[PDB]
């Protein structure tokens, strides 16, 4: 019933590990379909070969800008941006997958994986999934980031797709 997608992560081309995500399509369906479809690449464009452009140790890893590769772009499967579906789920801990945005109703394709409990984000970013397998791969990724987000090595989504 709820889809599961994976990401095979790479640090400058060396394979690092697989993170897999359960998308809560039963509560945030339109948000979960957009991440699912961008992971499969079935609509022609997507996450494969994009990188995490902003990694802040102890906060979150952000990625998903496949058009401009630096947080200023990305687009959804419904157009460039769409509404905040709802705020049922909250940022309860590491592994929560939440939507990045540029204020309300500006969701595109950027997402962030929390590596800590970030309750201040509640009510401001739609949560739509959580890490299933691979959280120590997300944790190891932190080491390649910095206080301001700049990463030291290129961290890419080498491959991604749907598992179930």
């Amino acid at each position: 019933v709820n889809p599961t997608v994976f990401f095979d992560i790479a640090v400058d081309g060396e394979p690092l590990g697989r993170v897999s995500f359960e998308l809560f399509a039963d509560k945030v369906p339109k948000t979960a379909e957009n991440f699912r479809a961008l992971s499969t690449g079935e609509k022609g464009f997507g996450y494969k070969g994009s990188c995490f452009h902003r990694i802040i140790p102890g906060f979150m890893c952000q990625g998903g800008d496949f058009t401009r590769h630096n947080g200023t772009g990305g687009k959804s499967i419904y157009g460039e941006k769409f509404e905040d579906e709802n705020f049922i789920l909250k940022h309860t801990g590491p592994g929560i997958l939440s939507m990045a945005n540029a204020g309300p109703n500006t969701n595109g394709s950027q997402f962030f994986i929390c590596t800590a409990k970030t309750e201040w984000l509640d009510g401001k970013h739609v949560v739509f999934g959580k890490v299933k397998e691979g959280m120590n791969i997300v944790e190891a990724m932190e080491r390649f980031g910095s206080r301001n987000g700049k990463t030291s090595k290129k961290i890419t989504i080498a491959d991604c797709g749907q598992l179930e």
């Binding site: 499969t40 690449g41 079935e42 609509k43 022609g44 464009f45 997507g46 058009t67 797709g161």
Partner: protein
């Protein structure tokens, strides 16, 4: 157009002459009216860019409309190339190079490459993109063919209310300025331009009146 097999996979299939004949006949007989876009979208479901270029080049006559459609497709392809630059260098073995705007149009690419794009993993919907572009062009064309403007509608003393509302909604569907503007127009301009007798019969029902009672009032 691609068609699925018994085991679920799909492979290219030659375009049926019946589809081309029906498309040309409906274009000739029904000219360029609002009801060509649904039939066009229904006729060429899953059609390759070559099939769409066929269905467009095969339309004899109305060459100005076809030139408008070609210009619209050209502008859309230029915008697509500007928003999605293609990479250079060697291409990965498991991936085929991404198409450019002129190649999304299907003008400078072979049919086998279109089939490979459409049946790739993950599939690339070049046919759907070019169909969206053609549908936008056809919307602009049916906008151009619109005979009269929406504001110039005024019912004659003898023209029945049925013909009046028919003409009104015809040019309204041909306008396609927006949806909420259309909703405001069908509230205001519809009742603003009635014949005085039936006009006051409609005003007797107030603005809360619906179209059914609006018509059966002036009926009989």
């Amino acid at each position: 157009p691609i068609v699925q097999n018994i085991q679920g996979q799909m492979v290219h299939q030659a375009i049926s002459p019946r589809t081309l004949n029906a498309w040309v006949k409906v274009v000739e007989e029904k000219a360029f009216s609002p009801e060509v876009i649904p039939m066009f979208s229904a006729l060429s479901e899953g059609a390759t860019p070559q099939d769409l270029n066929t269905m467009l080049n095969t339309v004899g006559g109305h060459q100005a409309a076809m030139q408008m459609l070609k210009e619209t497709i050209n502008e859309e392809a230029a915008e697509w190339d500007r928003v999605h630059p293609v990479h250079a260098g060697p291409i990965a073995p498991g991936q085929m190079r991404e198409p450019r705007g002129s190649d999304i149009a299907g003008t400078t690419s072979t049919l086998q490459e279109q089939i490979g794009w459409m049946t790739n993993n993950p599939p690339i919907p070049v046919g759907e993109i070019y169909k969206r572009w053609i549908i936008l062009g056809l919307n602009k064309i049916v906008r151009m063919y619109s005979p009269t403007s929406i504001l110039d509608i005024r019912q004659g003393p003898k023209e029945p209310f049925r013909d009046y509302v028919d003409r009104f909604y015809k040019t309204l569907r041909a306008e396609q300025a927006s949806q909420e503007v259309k909703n405001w127009m069908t509230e205001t301009l519809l009742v603003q331009n009635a014949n005085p007798d039936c006009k006051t019969i409609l005003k007797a029902l107030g603005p809360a009146a619906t179209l059914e009672e609006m018509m059966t009032a002036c009926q009989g």
